[PDB]
Every structure is written in structure tokens, then in C-alpha cells.
Design a binder for this molecule. Structure first.
Ligand SMILES: O=C1N(c2cncc3ccccc23)CCC[C@]12CCNc1ccc(Cl)cc12
Ligand SMILES: O=C1N(c2cncc3ccccc23)CCC[C@]12CCNc1ccc(Cl)cc12
Ligand SMILES: [Cl-]
Lengths: 302, 299
């Protein structure tokens, strides 16, 4: 029993964090095999950030301009190449702590763990989700660039995020490990704003099923709804449209609890209308949207 | 920016998790140097000296990854079983066994079959329970804090109470709370809110730009404690006020000034508003957690 926001054990990722320095700039890098991955803005000054020509800035660099530090050992850079917004620093030593890994690009609503790092040293681990507006509500200070987001499946670490910037609203933007940004963001100090954020509906439903599995049923009602009527109501509360894929994905939780997905949709509709009335659901006075259907099954069942 | 419930990096602890099997019971063990620490109920009105004397070293199957460790001795210390093994854990970090106080927070590496599955942050409640997330097989999972390179082990999971909350011991086998490792009627006592932690979290909200709850008012420590007692909040002591000093100096809001905000929040609610994305007053961040997260201390 109990339902917590749980991060994956960060050990496999800690053994990959290194410090990358280029001139005055210092950020984190991910050392996997003989390559260190880091945000390409490590080659920029604060001035360059407005309209940097990365290819022009990178061509002026040599391998010895990039100082890579793994613990108290300086790694030697023997090559460098840019792939989208990530700089790939070829080093002369393969990381002996390299875990089994994949680079995966995630979709909005997906959750992942973040190992927040400063100066190549891990300071904390937390759980978060790719918001529908492609930002993450992270906890990052200056120097956290290069910190990574990941999931672990069996013994394989799936790297899905690398931190690049903080937007003016305090939310965060970054790329997959192939250097492609999530959302319409650019690694430029230009006027960029997070789009209007919405609630991840499929995740709220999964969390309501987690509440049912943990014995919380107060919010259920005798009603059902059509998928379209649910979406018309959901849109009015800034909730993401629920698709037939979402309904299909909730099938296992529906079968386990005996509550049809459209039946749970009607409880959600009522909760949006009534609020919680001094009550909580899994120790929360707000509807939680950072647990996916897969996370609920993993934590409530194993 | 951003304020998340953050756990310490779990790597130093992952290298210590092993599976301990005795009979039909399988749970987790903590392998430090040549000793594996685990709940003594793995041997299971129990007489643990009587049950333990009937077991030999080879009855305890210890598995570290895909390697079976051989047990060469066993002894009990309070509610923890200490299994002497032939091999010292080469991944043993610098460590201490520390007993924490209620209101203190720690990270829990939840494990099943000696394999870590998740890490979360939590607080030792004033009623000595933890609001954790544990399933069958999670026994032996540990709670810890990291200071520089030293892992301070403060908790070992032993059981779940009927209300879904958890109970366990320090690494010396002494239970937190009036609990016993036996199947008997046990219940968590009435819980209270960790006041110093709520104040620390309110300071974290101010540091992150949330100021709506601030007011021009101040209060005495006694008037605040009369209010706090009415709302099942732990008494705030002068030590708590002293501990909040750095946050008070950083934000410019005196501790008793923040108490007047807390008094108004308790008496009137949040009024449809949130603080750090929360509609409830969060009490599982200590003043030190707020400082560490709002400064980027690394390990
Ligand atoms: O956001 C950025 N940073 C930060 C990143 N993450 C959390 C921060 C918390 C406080 C302060 C700065 C933070 C690090 C330095 C680069 C920068 C600076 C602002 N302009 C900018 C624009 C685009 C890009 Cl890709 C990076 C940046
Ligand atoms: O609490 C216990 N368990 C559990 C521990 N943690 C999360 C559980 C989630 C669901 C079910 C059982 C769980 C594991 C097995 C031992 C046990 C069983 C009940 N009787 C009992 C009495 C004393 C002691 Cl110390 C331990 C226990
Ligand atoms: Cl995905």
C-alpha cells in the first residue's frame, strides 16, 4: 500500500555524469562508451546566445578547448561533432560504468526521472513528466545544463531528456539525446514562451485508478459518459483531449478495478465540477497528472 | 527555479542491496563490508532467540546480483539480523548508522528480491510512521541521507500498518515508534503536521516567487503555538526558529512573520490558490532540504 511519486534508482546514470568546460562555461555531460554528450550551448558566451551560429562557433574549436572531468580524472577529448543541439565529444577512454542503454524520444504525458547535477556531480533525483506544452516542471539552477532524464526497464537505461534552458515562467526546456528539442524551443536567448499548459487527462485517470486500487472510492459515481461528451467537458478545464488510444491504454486498470474507462471519465467530470470538498485522493488535494498508466501498474502491482 | 520532492542519488545504496531468503520468506538485505543487515522477521508471538538458535548459516541464502554469498555467522541486534558473509562488499561506501528524529526527511530505495525498483523522499512522521510506498517483498528496503560522500543509513523497512502507513527500525534494529515486529493489533497514533517543515516550504515558495500568502503581520511564539496546537501542528520551538534563521535572512521575512502567514493559512485556507503547485501545506521538506535544493549541493 501507499502511492508515492517514485523516481528510478539513479546509480546507473550517476556513473555517467561528467563536467564539461569550454572557456568560462561549465555544465554537465553524459559519458557513455567513448562519447560525452552535452548541450551544444557549452560553446556559447552569454552574448552569443542571442543569435549563435553554432557551426561557426564549433569550427573555431579544437579538441583541447573542451575540458572534460570525470570525478578527479581529466578525460582527453579526441574528436567533436554536433548532432542537432547536442555536442558529442569523442574521448580517449570508454566509461567502464556505461550501463546497457537506449536513446528514446518520449511523447507529452510520459514520465521520467531527472538526475539533477552541478559540475558533473549528482545532487538529487526527482520524477517529472513531459508536459503537453513540451516543457518540464523541473528543479534546475544555473549549472544544471546537461542533467538528464531517464527511465529504467529491467537493466536498460532509456535516456529521454537532456536539460538545456529555463523559460521565463520557471519551467524547463530540453532535447532528446539526439539533440532534437522537445517543443518549439531553440537554444537561443530569444523571446520564447511556454505555450498554455494543459492537464494530462490519461494520467489523471490512471492516478484515479491507483486511488481505487489503494481503497479510495469516494469520488466514483453511478454515471458513465461518451468519449465525446467527456472531451467537451475536459477541454473547458484545460484538460488534454482523451483519445481512443488513451482509453485502450487504461484497459488493464479498468479490468483490474472493475470500473469502465468511460465510468472513470464520469468521476473525473464530477471532480472537475465539484472540487474535492475538503477531501484528498492519495494524500493529494489536486488531481495528479504526473503518473502514467504504466507507472500506476508498476507501483501498485509490480 | 522549480521545487520538487527530491531524493538523494541512490547509487551508493544500490551497490549494497542483496536478496535474503530463509525458508519461504524472501526480503532485502543491506551488504556493508562483510555483514548483511536485514529484518529479523526473515527467520519467521515470536521468540526470535528461540527461532534464530534453530537456524544454521547455510539456511540463509544471500544473493548479491547473480552471485550467491556464503553466510559464515549470524547474530541479532534488536530487530535486525546481522549475517556475517565471507566476502566484503567491494561497493561499500563511506557510511554511518544514524537514528533520525520525527520531522527529519530521508530517501528510501524501495527494493524487491534485492533489486532496487525506485527511490522516493519522505519524512519520519511525528507518530513515527512513514507514508511510504511498499508492497510485499519490500522488507529490508532502506532509508538514507547523503552528506558529502558519506551515506547515513537511518531506516530499514519492517512492516505496514492497517492504515497503509509504514513502520521500521534504525540500522541498529531499534523501531521508530511504539511498534513491535509481530502480528498483533498495532495502529499508527494520531499524526500531526511538521510545523518547522511547513515554514521551510513556505520560504521555498517565497524564494521561487510565490508571495501571495505573505502579510504585514507578526506573532509571538506562544500565540503561534496556541494556534498550531488547535490545528494538529507540532509545537514550534526556539530551536526551529533558529534553524529557520538562514531562510529568514535570505528572504527578508522573519520566522514569526512567516508564522503569521501560516496562522492565516490555517484559519482561512488557500482560497482556490496553490503554493508550489500544492493545495495542501507540504511538511516533508526540512529547512536543510530547502537550502540544499535552493543552492545545488552535490554528492
Ligand atoms: O536557461 C539558461 N540557463 C538555465 C538553465 N536551467 C536552469 C536555470 C536556472 C536559473 C538560471 C538559468 C538556468 C543556463 C545558462 C543558459 C541559459 C541562460 C538564459 N538563456 C538561455 C537561453 C537558451 C538556452 Cl538553451 C540556455 C539559456
Ligand atoms: O507488514 C508485513 N509485510 C508488509 C510490509 N510492507 C508492505 C506490505 C504491503 C502489503 C502487505 C504486507 C506488507 C511484509 C511481510 C511481513 C508483514 C506481514 C503482516 N504482518 C507483519 C507483522 C509484523 C511485521 Cl514486522 C511484518 C509483517
Ligand atoms: Cl513516450
Amino acid at each position: 500500500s501507499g502511492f508515492r511519486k517514485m523516481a528510478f534508482p539513479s546509480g546507473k546514470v550517476e556513473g555517467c555524469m561528467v563536467q564539461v568546460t569550454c572557456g568560462t562555461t561549465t555544465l554537465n555531460g553524459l559519458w557513455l562508451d567513448d562519447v560525452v554528450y552535452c548541450p551544444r550551448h557549452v560553446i556559447c558566451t552569454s552574448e552569443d546566445m542571442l543569435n549563435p551560429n553554432y557551426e561557426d562557433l564549433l569550427i573555431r574549436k579544437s579538441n583541447h578547448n573542451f575540458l572534460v572531468q570525470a570525478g578527479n580524472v581529466q578525460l582527453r577529448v579526441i574528436g567533436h561533432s554536433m548532432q542537432n543541439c547536442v555536442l558529442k565529444l569523442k574521448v580517449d577512454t570508454a566509461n567502464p560504468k556505461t550501463p546497457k542503454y537506449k536513446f528514446v524520444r518520449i511523447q507529452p504525458g510520459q514520465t521520467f526521472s531527472v538526475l539533477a547535477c552541478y559540475n558533473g556531480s549528482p545532487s538529487g533525483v526527482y520524477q517529472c513528466a513531459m508536459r503537453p506544452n513540451f516543457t518540464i516542471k523541473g528543479s534546475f539552477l544555473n549549472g544544471s545544463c546537461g542533467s538528464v532524464g531517464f527511465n529504467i526497464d529491467y537493466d536498460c537505461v532509456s535516456f529521454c531528456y537532456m536539460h538545456h534552458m529555463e523559460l521565463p515562467t520557471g519551467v524547463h526546456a530540453g532535447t532528446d539525446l539526439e539533440g532534437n528539442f522537445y517543443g518549439p524551443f531553440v537554444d537561443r536567448q530569444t523571446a520564447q514562451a511556454a505555450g498554455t499548459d494543459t492537464t494530462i487527462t490519461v494520467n489523471v485517470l490512471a492516478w484515479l485508478y491507483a486511488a481505487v486500487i489503494n481503497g479510495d472510492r469516494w469520488f466514483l459515481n453511478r454515471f458513465t459518459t461518451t468519449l465525446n461528451d467527456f472531451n467537451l467537458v475536459a477541454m473547458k478545464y484545460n484538460y488534454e483531449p482523451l483519445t481512443q488510444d488513451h482509453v485502450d491504454i487504461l484497459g488493464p486498470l479498468s479490468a483490474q478495478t472493475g470500473i469502465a474507462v468511460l465510468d472513470m471519465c464520469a468521476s473525473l467530470k464530477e471532480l472537475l465540477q465539484n472540487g474535492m470538498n475538503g477531501r484528498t485522493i492519495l494524500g493529494s488535494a489536486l488531481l495528479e497528472d504526473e503518473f502514467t498508466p504504466f507507472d500506476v501498474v508498476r507501483q501498485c502491482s509490480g
